[PDB]
Structure formats: structure tokens, C-alpha cells
Write an enzyme that holds these catalytic residues in place. Sequence first.
Site, short mmCIF file in Angstrom:
data_model
loop_
_atom_site.label_atom_id
_atom_site.label_comp_id
_atom_site.label_asym_id
_atom_site.label_seq_id
_atom_site.Cartn_x
_atom_site.Cartn_y
_atom_site.Cartn_z
N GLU A 189 0.79 -1.23 0.00
CA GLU A 189 0.00 0.00 0.00
C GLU A 189 0.83 1.28 0.00
O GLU A 189 0.30 2.33 -0.40
CB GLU A 189 -0.92 0.03 1.22
CG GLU A 189 -2.13 -0.88 1.15
CD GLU A 189 -3.06 -0.54 0.00
OE1 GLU A 189 -3.31 0.66 -0.22
OE2 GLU A 189 -3.54 -1.47 -0.67
N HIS B 3 -15.45 -7.71 -7.44
CA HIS B 3 -15.21 -6.83 -8.58
C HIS B 3 -16.35 -6.88 -9.59
O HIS B 3 -16.72 -5.85 -10.16
CB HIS B 3 -13.89 -7.21 -9.25
CG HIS B 3 -12.68 -6.80 -8.48
ND1 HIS B 3 -12.11 -7.61 -7.52
CD2 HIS B 3 -11.93 -5.67 -8.51
CE1 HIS B 3 -11.06 -7.00 -7.00
NE2 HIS B 3 -10.93 -5.82 -7.58
#
Lengths: 248, 596
Positions: B357, B487
Amino acid sequence: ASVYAWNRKRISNCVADYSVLYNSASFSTFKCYGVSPTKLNDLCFTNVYADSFVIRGDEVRQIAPGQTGKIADYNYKLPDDFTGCVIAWNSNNLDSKVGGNYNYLYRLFRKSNLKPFERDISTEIYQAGSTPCNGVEGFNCYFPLQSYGFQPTNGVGYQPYRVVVLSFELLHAPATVCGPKKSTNLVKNKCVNFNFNGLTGTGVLTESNKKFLPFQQFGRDIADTTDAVRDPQTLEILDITPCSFGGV
Amino acid sequence: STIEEQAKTFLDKFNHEAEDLFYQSSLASWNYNTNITEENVQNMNNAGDKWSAFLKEQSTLAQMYPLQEIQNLTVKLQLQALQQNGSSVLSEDKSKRLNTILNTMSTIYSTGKVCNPDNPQECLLLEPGLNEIMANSLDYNERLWAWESWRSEVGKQLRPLYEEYVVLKNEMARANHYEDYGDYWRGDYEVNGVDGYDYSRGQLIEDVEHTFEEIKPLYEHLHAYVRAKLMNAYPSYISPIGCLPAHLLGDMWGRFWTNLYSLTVPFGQKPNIDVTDAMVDQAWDAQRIFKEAEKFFVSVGLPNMTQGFWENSMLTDPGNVQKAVCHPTAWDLGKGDFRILMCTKVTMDDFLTAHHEMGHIQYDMAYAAQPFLLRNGANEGFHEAVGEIMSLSAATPKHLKSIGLLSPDFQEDNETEINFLLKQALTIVGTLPFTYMLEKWRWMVFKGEIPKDQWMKKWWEMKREIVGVVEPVPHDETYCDPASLFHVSNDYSFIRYYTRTLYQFQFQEALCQAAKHEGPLHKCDISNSTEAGQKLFNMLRLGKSEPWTLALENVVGAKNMNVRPLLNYFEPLFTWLKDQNKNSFVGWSTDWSPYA
Ligand SMILES: *[C@@H]1O[C@H](CO)[C@@H](O)[C@H](O)[C@H]1NC(C)=O
Ligand SMILES: *[C@@H]1O[C@H](CO)[C@@H](O)[C@H](O)[C@H]1NC(C)=O
Ligand SMILES: *[C@@H]1O[C@H](CO)[C@@H](O)[C@H](O)[C@H]1NC(C)=O
Ligand SMILES: *[C@@H]1O[C@H](CO)[C@@H](O)[C@H](O)[C@H]1NC(C)=O
Ligand SMILES: *[C@@H]1O[C@H](CO)[C@@H](O)[C@H](O)[C@H]1NC(C)=O
Ligand SMILES: *[C@@H]1O[C@H](CO)[C@@H](O)[C@H](O)[C@H]1NC(C)=O
Ligand SMILES: *[C@@H]1O[C@H](CO)[C@@H](O)[C@H](O)[C@H]1NC(C)=O
């Protein structure tokens, strides 16, 4: 004030101290162009007009002599080889608020490049097309005016730095004001050179029984021989006479 | 009086107006994800609606600019992205089915239920209840019940909801003068107006399918190796003549096989590369973890992080009453504000997620000099693959031994590296056919050449053929288990993960050639080379301002998606797998043997 409404106030008839800036320990863009910061103290020119305005962190590079861009071309253009200094410091602690500080505005568009040292104050809109706008926003109005937004979480490159611009030029206006001159230390009973404000000479201190008037800077006795001075530092009278000399 | 000067005036007006509104919407969304109150939900929807309505107004104003005379490519890409109508083509009675359906999907998926039917004792939510029963237990009976606990209790109520979503999103393509909704997602990779550089929308399906005939022989040998250390624990309990169950492949979907490592360790006698016990003797914390990561990057040549991130972002789980979700996500609030939102833990996954991240944050300021509309990646695959190439470098033995996490006396034989590289192949190579099949399944059903009664008989027959999984229970057409994934239900393009692998290894070979490493790619390193860092940052900083097909020609010279410089990384692994499968039955046909 804002970048498009930069003020211009002259500093004259008083001594301007630049030494405090060196040890301020708060500036981040203490850069001088065309003159060293130290050597402009003793010697300087008149026309000390100071320009104050707000420049974003990423916009600092734009504001420099010989450099063009958006702010440097539509808000305030610095002439190339500008004899002056720029001093900027962080203003987040005061010139910032949560949600955006909507108090500083700027010109986003202009028909032609700004003349150096020109302040633009107008509501005229940009005219890129042929059809003008009658006050109603459309496809060719593009209201140039926009409000800067500064927040406490802004990145270091985007922090609003409070910067001022100093201009130095020699015009016919006389009696310029420069930095103060450090005073030396007293020396007693010695044939020592002296250089007061305007006059200089060599001599030694000897007792005198005659008092000088208080509204003269220097005096002479015979054959344009300057032998009396009045120090304005404390008005304490000291006697100066040429030291002894002769042939061997 | 020129169109060229008129576009720069409009984008200059939009950039300053939008970045004021985008910083208010991102700040409002940040406070909702950290401090949930009753008033904070109303504050976020108020700011988010006027930001979404602002892009609706700017897209209509940019529509009147004709696109047939703009020779400049920097403003052509900006006008193409700004003029995307999106939901404006649909009518008001049809646009209300977007926000109504999409908010219903999030709330329905948020209902956690593990109470047993006809046995109502108690049940907790999804995160503490459902995730522990799939990642830790090794019992066959309840997991077979657990397989039917979600695809027959959650997906049964999605069949009337997901079908309404796929009948109105498909209609936008005719309203946008496209063929279908699957072709609309290929418009991001579409390049037009350049002679000899044109990329057709339909050529990508053929080129992707042409590259799949060399992935398959790699996956045939990968499945053969992993089947020998699992049939050892169940000799006579599973027959070694058919396929594998779906509920035994690590996750619910079988995308990642990381949870099979404890069950399928190759050689557990020697200790694994594990420094979790090493960090607790020297009392390592969250602050010292990220400081050594920062000095690794400044040694390469990349600029260090700004001072408005360490005292502004959050690192650990704060307080006790704050039950806000801390899924690892990257935050781009704009105006120089960048944050990382995650709950740190002293684990294997959170340490790797800490590296994963942070890379998106370091990518966001790289293209900070680009304009706001071009302040993004070159495509959807660049921003994910850039954040993972440094994960490969941080796993190198010199860097693990450089800080002191690994033991100072750790030998490096054959088996300590084949075990690591094949485990990485299962999480990277093994996910390529799963990513390609699902996006391939979504394109024809969005195209519409699949009837209602032929969803399951075609969906199941390719899972048995390509993946090789026998269905543990027959399912009819009323089930909608392919729409359960995160998704697909939320309108996310899943093709960005297939191109992530092909990008993260194109950069590795390009940077290793820049560093003049003498040896193969598996032992290569990127660190301690400032020439490669300036080479990457020159390529990272372009963003979306240039076409992506020009980005490939700037590094490799091949305009297409090359697959050759990926097999060269795994030649030591592939030659051993070819020798190990001399006698095993490689290659499955159609198999109705177990469930005839
Ligand atoms: C200037 O003169 C005043 C008169 O008393 C004196 O107090 C002061 O110290 C003088 N300035 C300096 C710098 O000594
Ligand atoms: C954080 O949340 C609590 C309750 O969830 C609320 O009382 C408090 O005001 C919030 N803090 C801020 C700064 O809004
Ligand atoms: C093309 O547009 C970009 C806008 O970013 C501009 O910088 C560049 O000078 C333009 N080039 C030409 C040849 O018009
Ligand atoms: C977008 O919608 C406008 C009307 O709202 C229409 O004139 C325009 O052609 C549409 N553009 C596309 C690409 O669908
Ligand atoms: C980042 O690097 C610059 C240049 O070396 C340095 O001046 C600055 O102090 C560094 N930042 C921190 C937080 O150490
Ligand atoms: C080399 O690989 C073989 C695997 O066939 C292994 O048995 C051997 O131990 C490895 N070499 C060393 C020095 O460990
Ligand atoms: C690479 O750089 C690190 C910096 O900490 C250093 O410790 C290491 O020895 C270097 N390795 C090589 C091969 O230069």
C-alpha cells in the site's frame, strides 16, 4: 494582499536592518539575485519599494527573474536580472484553515503578458473566441478570477509561503537609506585615525578648556584645518588634535 | 481564435475548480471511514452528490468541441476522458436504477449470517465469523456445508437483482453507439488517430487468446506438482483419477493457494524463511518497520516522503470503540494530502501489505507535475504492477539479511529458492488463467450471445476443461455464483490483474538490463543503482499524458504485450517441472467419471 493586488510601499528616511533576517531561523527561500545579502547592508540604492503577496509552495519557482509560467505571466512578472532579493517562509500556522482559505485570489488568464512591475485590477474576462459574453457564463466566458485554497494538510510542496519582493534601483531621488554601520571601540591617548560620518583624519586626544557648540558636526580653526568634531552617539565631548611630529 | 488555445483555457478552468471540489469529497469520504456517526453519513452524501453532478456539467460543455481537428495528443486524451457521458445517456427513469441497485448490493453483501438452519444458537458477522472458518479449519464435512452456506443462502437472492443490472448497463452501448458493454471497457486501451500505432478494439481479444496457448502448458505442469503432496494425506479418501474439489483451493474462489502451504509444505524439516520470531527479540514496532523501508528507497534514488504524512496519517488500530473498517487502501485526497488507511499487525501479510500500500502513495506524487485530468496511471495495470516490483526486491536475501531480520548464518542452497519461487508462481502464474477466464466469461455475456439456459452448462464445462475442477454438487440455472465476487458486482474491470503480471516483469528485465547485472533474472536486484531509479522515475512520471502504446515503445520497443520475457524468469523452475512430470498423467480431457 493577494498576488494580483500586490501592494507597493516605499521605505525611506529610516534605517533598514537586514542582519536580523540572516539569524531569523524562520525563512526557507532566503535567496538574493544580483547582489549578495551581506554586501547590500553597507551600500544600497533608493527606491526600496516592497512588494508583498502570497505564493504557493509549488509556485515559488515561477516567481524568479527570467522565469515565465502561470503566476509569473498573468499575475506578477519579474524582469530578468532583477536586482533584488526574495525571502519566503511557511505561513501554515496562520495563513491556512480547514476546508480551504478562500481569501487570496489571482488572475488565471490574460490576453497579453503582464508588463514587469504592473498591478492588474480589472474584472475583464478572457476572450479566446470571437463572440463576447454578456455576463452569463457560457462556452467562451471563462471567468479568469479564482480563489486559492490552502488547508493545514497541504503537502510541503503546496504549502503557502509568505514571501515579499524587494527592489533596488538608483533614481534621481537622493538620500537613500541603507543598513546600519557597526561602531568601533574607543581608544584613548594614541595617534589614531578617525573617520566620522563624512570626514576623516588622524590625531590624538588632548585636554581642552574650550567648549564647542552643540549644533555643529565638525569645525575648523585656521587655514581650513578641521580640528573639532562632535560625536552624535552620546553627545559626550571628546577632544581631538593632530598628534606630534617632527624631524630627526 | 484557435481551437488549440481554446482547449488549454477550458482545462485550466476545470483543473482549479475540480481540485477544490475533489479535496472536499475526498476529505468527507476520509472522515466517514475513520469516525462513523449518524451525522457523518449525511455530510458525505451531500458533498459527494455535488461533486458527481459537477463532472456531469463539465462533460456536456466539452461535448461541443469537435475531435476531428485536434492534432495535439496531450489535450486529446483529456477531452476523451472528460467527454465520457457515463450515466447521462440513460433516461431519468433508468438512471435511478443505478444508485438504487448498487446501494442494495452493498447492504445485502454486508449482512452476516452463520446461524445454522433448524439450529438457531448464535451467529456473528462476516469478518470475525466467516473468515476464520475458511482460513484455519481442515475439516471436510462442515466446509461442504459452508460451500452451500453462501452460494445457496446469499447468491439465491441475487438472481433477480444481478440480472436487472446486466440488462440496463448493456443498453448504454447502443446509446453510446458501441457494440456492447464488453467493448466499452476496451475503450480505455483503444488508440486512434495515429498512423501505424492504431490498436483495434477487437484485436485485443485475439492477441490475448493467442498468448493463452503458452500459459496452458505451464499450468499443466503446475497442477501436476501440487497434486502429489496432497494425495499423501488422503490416500484412499479421495480418488487420484479425477479433479479436485472447489472448496479446497485456499480461498472461497481458489484464486490464492496461500492457505495450502501449511498442508502442502514441500520440505518442512528445515525451517522456513520466517522472521516473525526474530522481530520480537529486538522489540520491533510499526514505526521502526517503516523507517527501514524509507531508507531503502532513498538509497535507490527516489525522493523521500513528505513531512505532512507521518504526523497526519494513521498507522495502527486506534482506540477501542472505533470499529471502522481498515481495509488496506491508498488515499489521494489531493492538494498534497496523501494517507494510508490500514490496521497494522505483526504478521506475514500485514508486513507485505505495508510494502504494497505504500507503493501507490509513492506513485501518486510521481506524476504530481502532470495536470489533474492526467494525474493517473497510464492504464489500470500500471498502478498495480508498479507497487509490486519493489515487493520482489524486498524479498531478496541481501535486503532481509541487511536489516538483520534473517539470521546472520542462513545458507542458500537449491531447495531454499525453488520452494520460494514456485510458491510465488502459484500466487502470480496461477492467478493468470483465473483472471483471463472470468473476464472472458463477462465479455460474451455482455455481448449477449449466451442464452439464459446456457450460463451454467458453459460456465461449468470450461472450469472442468481449463482449470480442471469437478463440481462437488450439480447446480441449475437459478444459481448466480459468478456474480458473488467483489469486482464483478461493483463494476470493476478485472483485466487489470492479468496485465499486472505482464507489466511487473517487463519492468524487471528492463531495469536489470539498465543495472548491467551479470546473471539470470532470479538473482537480479534493482537496489544500489541510481541509474535504474532515474530510468524508472522518468517512465513513472508520464502517467496518462502519453498513450500507453507509446509507453511500451519507450522501454522495450515492442508495441504489443510480450510474453517471452516472463518464461526466462522461470527457466530454472520450468526445467525441473518438465523432468518431474515424466510419468504423471499431464493433460485432462472431459471427465464425467466421478459424477456420471
Ligand atoms: C544614542 O544616544 C542616546 C542618548 O542618550 C543614548 O542613550 C544611546 O545609547 C545612543 N545609541 C547608542 C547605540 O549607543
Ligand atoms: C468520533 O465518533 C464518536 C462516536 O462514534 C463521536 O462522538 C465523536 O464526536 C467523533 N469525533 C469527531 C472528531 O467527530
Ligand atoms: C500539446 O499540448 C500540450 C498540453 O500539455 C502542450 O504542453 C504542448 O506544447 C502541445 N504541443 C503542441 C505541438 O501543440
Ligand atoms: C452525450 O450526451 C449528449 C446529450 O446529453 C449527446 O449530445 C452526446 O452525443 C453524447 N455523447 C456520447 C459519446 O454518447
Ligand atoms: C528528505 O531528503 C532531503 C534531502 O536529502 C532532506 O533534506 C530531508 O531532511 C529528508 N526528510 C526527512 C524527513 O528526513
Ligand atoms: C541442490 O538441489 C538438490 C535437489 O535435487 C538438493 O538435494 C541439494 O541439497 C541441493 N544442493 C545443496 C548444496 O543443498
Ligand atoms: C546495497 O546497499 C545496501 C544499503 O544498506 C548495503 O548494505 C549493501 O551492502 C549493498 N549491496 C551491494 C552488493 O552493493
